[PDB]
A paper describes a structure:
In the fourth step in this pathway, UDP-2,3-diacylglucosamine is hydrolyzed to 2,3-diacylglucosamine-1-phosphate (also called lipid X) and UMP. This step is catalyzed by the specific pyrophosphatase LpxH in 70% of gram-negative bacteria, including E. coli and Pseudomonas aeruginosa, and by LpxI in the remaining 30%345. LpxH shares sequence similarity with metallophosphoesterases and requires Mn2+ ions for phosphatase activity. PaLpxH consists of two domains: a catalytic domain homologous to metallophosphoesterases (MPEs) and a helical insertion domain (HI domain) inserted in the middle of the catalytic domain.
PaLpxH was crystallized in the presence of Mn2+ ions, which are required for enzymatic activity. Two PaLpxH molecules were present in the asymmetric unit of the P21 crystal, and all 239 amino acid residues were unambiguously determined for both molecules. Furthermore, the high-resolution electron density (1.65 Å) clearly identified a stoichiometrically bound product molecule (lipid X, 2,3-diacylglucosamine-1-phosphate) and two Mn2+ ions in each PaLpxH molecule. The lipid X molecule was likely captured in E. coli cells because no substrate molecule (UDP-2,3-diacylglucosamine) or product molecule (lipid X) was added during purification or crystallization. At the boundary between the catalytic and HI domains, invariant residues and two Mn2+ ions form a dinuclear metal center. Lipid X is positioned in a crevice between the catalytic and HI domains, with the phosphate group facing the dinuclear metal center and two acyl chains buried in the hydrophobic cavity. Six ligands [Asp8, His10, Asp41 (bridging two Mn2+ ions), His197, and two hydroxide ions (designated as W1 and W2)] are octahedrally coordinated with Mn1. In contrast, five ligands provide an incomplete octahedral coordination with Mn2: Asp41, Asn79, His114, His195, and W2 (bridging two Mn2+ ions). In the EP complex, the phosphate group of lipid X (corresponding to the beta phosphate moiety of UDP-2,3-diacylglucosamine) is strongly bound to Arg80 through a bidentate salt bridge. W1 is positioned close enough to attack the alpha phosphate of the substrate in the ES complex, as deduced from the structure of the EP complex.
Author numbering: 2 to 240
Write the structure that this text describes.
């Protein structure tokens, strides 16, 4: 089987989430063929050169699972799009670009964090375009570590303020973007996170049934989607 998780937002001051995650690694990821982490794995990331002791311990926990034979794939989210090759080397995982199409039991499956689908949120679309601009990435990595933390705190503050003011349909995926992006990648299945609204959505693409599976966030309970050749199930479990 294969496991999909996202939106853990791991941080030193949420040991309840960390403990649930490590137990999940021991009890389920170790026995899986592969684990996919579809963004927002950490609460924030300023660059691999800024990794703290907590984040290094998480890398070491992933590495134990990777060394056991489980293939681990990590995709950026909007909290942690600065994760790089040094982290993945320590963690024994493979960095997957957003978007990525994988082969899952013979089916092409599209994987994304999900925030790129939130095209009705023009303020966020503008921020994302700036944050991912190579010129922005260039100047950001020239900031001292402490100053990067400052700017990350400022982005979190403004995001918390602004997101509270937005309507639900502004922060969720744009409905018409789903068939558009899925058709472009030639898939009938899309798995993403970001929206913190775990669900499976059936839809039509060109007169054919398709599905969009949304992974749950870990603020109140853990979540995992498990797929094998015979079926799939996403279910929560207590922290
Ligand atoms: C190099 C290291 C330091 C710098 C890089 C650090 C990178 C890590 C920081 C992560 C911040 C991230 O939370 C911002 C973000 O993505 N917010 C959108 C997202 O909310 P999440 O809660 O993150 O899922 O998803 C929400 C739902 O889709 C969406 O609503 C949020 O987006 C916003 O709220 C954005 C606001 O609409 C616009 C904010 C503009 C802020 C500008 C601040 C600086 C201005 C200073 C000018 C003087
Ligand atoms: Mn998230
Ligand atoms: Mn997100």
């Amino acid at each position: 089987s294969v496991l999909f998780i996202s939106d853990l937002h791991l941080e030193a001051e949420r040991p309840d989430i960390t403990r649930a995650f490590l137990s999940f690694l021991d009890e389920r990821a170790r026995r899986a063929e592969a684990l996919y982490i579809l963004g927002d794995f950490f609460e924030a990331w300023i660059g691999d050169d800024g990794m703290d002791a907590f984040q290094r311990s998480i890398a070491q926990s992933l590495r134990q699972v990777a060394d056991g034979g489980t293939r681990i794939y990590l995709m950026h989210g909007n909290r942690d799009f600065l994760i790089g090759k040094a982290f993945c080397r320590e963690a024994g995982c493979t960095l997957l670009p957003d978007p990525s199409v994988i082969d899952l039991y013979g089916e092409p499956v599209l994987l994304m964090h999900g925030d790129s689908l939130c095209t009705r949120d023009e303020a966020y679309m503008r921020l994302r375009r700036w944050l991912r601009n190579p010129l922005t990435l260039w100047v950001l990595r020239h900031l001292p570590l402490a100053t990067r933390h400052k700017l990350a705190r400022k982005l979190r503050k403004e995001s918390r303020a602004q997101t509270r003011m937005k309507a639900v349909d502004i922060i969720d995926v744009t409905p018409e973007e789903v068939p558009r992006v899925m058709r472009g990648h030639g898939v009938r299945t899309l798995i993403h996170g970001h929206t913190h609204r775990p669900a499976e959505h059936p839809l039509d693409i060109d007169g054919q049934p398709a599905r969009r599976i949304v992974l749950g966030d870990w603020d109140r309970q853990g979540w995992a989607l498990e797929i094998d050749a015979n079926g799939h199930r996403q279910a929560p479990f207590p922290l």
